[PDB]
Design a protein around this ligand. Structure first.
Ligand SMILES: Nc1ncnc2c1ncn2[C@@H]1O[C@@H](OP(=O)(O)OCCc2c[nH]c3ccccc23)[C@H](O)[C@H]1O
Length: 564
């Protein structure tokens, strides 16, 4: 098609001209934002070229920018980071001091995100044909918002995007017709949103040509939801009535097109769900599904076998590489094997620099900043920390992502995603690091003072046998008086104290949308460790063989949308 051709040509043009496009993007940023408080701090003297930018503007982490960001949060509306007003903060799933990081954005950034989204289907159509003959079943969700003292909205980037006009009144695309109505996606009640997205997907089962969600965990949560709610769902289809549990009238209305008594379909679906073996169930309920559109690169790799199990070995497409700070780029070959996925950073999105991995763990100098390596000049096989300069006022901002160059498409590098720095445990969007986990152990261990017990040793892993997944922590204890050992009731309170100690995103996954299961402490017999922490990353079976008792957190930890 003509629209696809234009989009592919855009890729070619951006990729052939990577270095000059990068140059222009920076010049635009520096021309517009030249007068900002932050830039004028480093005597840029109006210069809009790479070389003075590199030698004067420090390379920073989130903490470095907090003075400027807090002032904006607290209502200072002057040109501090951007010439344009900061339209809102996009809350990263990555945290600082336990709280989601506030990433500044501006209004026109939405156009760039939309631009990147518009490239995905033209690329996909090359590899998978006939996607216009049907629909996608995607499970997409908004998350809660809050406002900063100065009145700025603070919410996840996906929420900001789903609730924007670029999504709600998105351009028509016959290769991108979703089963889920906007009102389901936009519904603030996760149960109702999931419920109706599933119902619509079941009603339109035969038109379904792909299943998806942003993350692998999201799609698994959907499959588990069906496992747990197919009784009510099938009753609804049979009767052509919508469960009273759906109280949001706007959501009640969006389902009206499909809600028709269909006993045949209700019997087919219950026929499949009542089986105790769910291997391949995806292609029995949705028999025309060609692939699963779900991120399985990075931390989500852990989910590939569970996905293959339910899908019967269907291809997995990882489409996009993006963040709260900046949408990065796309996968020019969506049909490649998960372990061989490369992402091509799109040079129109921001100004991208790279810090060689081997230099990334030593403090950088503010008065003499490193040159870094430009997007066009990275070397195949080398590893880098991603560094960004955005239109919204992030200047030489270290994302924390390690990337490995695997090749080039024209002049644009392609990147294998290695990892987000210092992330030990993750189930869904939660990212828990060594320090948070350590302080979490210390907190729960003090609760053991009611006996003579202390924690001699610990390790962890993210357990994905269960949906939702959960953190498992292995505890070697030291009980001075065997007669006064700690009980199941107390060790459960040790679990909940650990959870209480973890970051906002963890606690939210427990509370808001059921995307993280209860944290589990496994008490190992004395002396187990000797034969390395604080995480396992087989080996767990060896540890499990020595497990005396296992304890699950009994209640939900504290979480509200409000920030500290
Ligand atoms: N394809 C990928 N494979 C491994 N890891 C990936 C990854 N894409 C991102 N990440 C990690 O997520 C980012 O975090 P964040 O919460 O800000 O955004 C949520 C993601 C997000 C927000 N809109 C989107 C639109 C499309 C795809 C992903 C997103 C971190 O940079 C990065 O390490």
């Amino acid at each position: 098609s003509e629209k696809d051709a234009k989009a592919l040509q855009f890729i070619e043009e951006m990729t052939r001209n990577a270095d000059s496009v990068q140059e222009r993007v920076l010049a635009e940023i520096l021309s517009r934002n030249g007068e900002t408080e932050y830039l004028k701090r480093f005597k840029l003297e109006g210069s809009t070229v790479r070389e003075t930018f590199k030698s004067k503007i420090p390379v920073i982490k989130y903490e470095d920018l907090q003075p400027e960001i807090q002032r904006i949060a607290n209502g200072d509306r002057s040109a501090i980071l951007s010439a344009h007003p900061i339209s809102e903060f996009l809350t990263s799933s990555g945290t600082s001091a336990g709280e989601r990081k506030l990433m500044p954005t501006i209004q026109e950034e939405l156009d760039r995100r939309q631009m990147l989204y518009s490239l995905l289907m033209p690329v996909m159509n090359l590899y998978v044909p006939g996607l216009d003959k049907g629909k996608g079943l995607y499970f997409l969700f908004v998350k809660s918002e809050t406002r900063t003292p100065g009145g700025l909205l603070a919410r996840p980037v996906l929420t900001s995007y789903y609730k924007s006009e670029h999504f709600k009144t998105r351009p028509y695309d016959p290769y991108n017709v979703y089963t889920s109505p906007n009102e389901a996606i936009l519904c603030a009640d996760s149960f109702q949103s999931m419920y109706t997205q599933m119902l619509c997907g079941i009603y339109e089962r035969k038109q379904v040509l792909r299943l998806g969600a942003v993350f692998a965990s999201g799609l698994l949560r959907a499959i588990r939801f069906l496992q747990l709610n197919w009784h009510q769902l099938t009753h609804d289809i049979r009767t052509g009535t919508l469960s009273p549990k759906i109280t949001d009238p706007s959501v009640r209305n969006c389902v009206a097109g499909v809600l028709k008594p269909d006993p045949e379909l209700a019997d087919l679906v219950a026929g499949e769900c009542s089986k105790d073996n769910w291997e391949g169930i995806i292609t029995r309920i949705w028999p025309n599904t060609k692939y699963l559109d779900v991120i399985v690169t990075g931390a989500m790799a852990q989910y590939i076998p569970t996905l293959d199990y339910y899908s019967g070995g269907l291809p997995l497409a990882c489409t996009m590489y993006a963040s709260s700070e900046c949408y990065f780029g796309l996968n020019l070959n969506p049909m490649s094997k998960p372990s061989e996925v490369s992402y091509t950073i799109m040079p129109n999105m921001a100004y991208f620099e790279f810090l060689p991995h081997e230099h990334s763990s030593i403090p950088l100098s503010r008065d003499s900043p490193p040159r870094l390596v430009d997007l066009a000049h990275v070397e195949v096989g080398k590893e880098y920390e991603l560094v960004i300069t955005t239109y919204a006022g992030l200047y030489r901002y270290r994302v924390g992502d390690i990337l490995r160059v695997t090749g080039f498409h024209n002049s644009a590098p392609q990147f294998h995603f290695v990892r987000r720095k210092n992330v030990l445990l993750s189930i869904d969007s939660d990212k828990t690091d060594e320090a948070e986990l350590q302080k979490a152990v210390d907190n729960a261990s003090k609760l053991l003072r009611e006996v003579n017990t202390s924690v001699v040793e610990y390790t962890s892993f993210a357990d994905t046998k269960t949906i939702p997944g959960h953190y498992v922590i292995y505890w070697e204890l030291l009980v001075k008086d065997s007669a006064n050992s700690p009980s199941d009731e107390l060790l459960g309170q040790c679990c909940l104290a650990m959870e209480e100690s973890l970051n906002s995103v963890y606690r939210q996954g427990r509370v808001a949308d059921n995307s993280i299961g209860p944290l589990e402490i496994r008490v190992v017999k004395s002396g187990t460790f000797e034969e390395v922490p604080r995480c396992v990353n087989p080996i767990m079976e060896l540890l499990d063989s020595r497990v005396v008792s296992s304890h699950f957190s009994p209640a939900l930890p504290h979480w509200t949308p409000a920030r500290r």
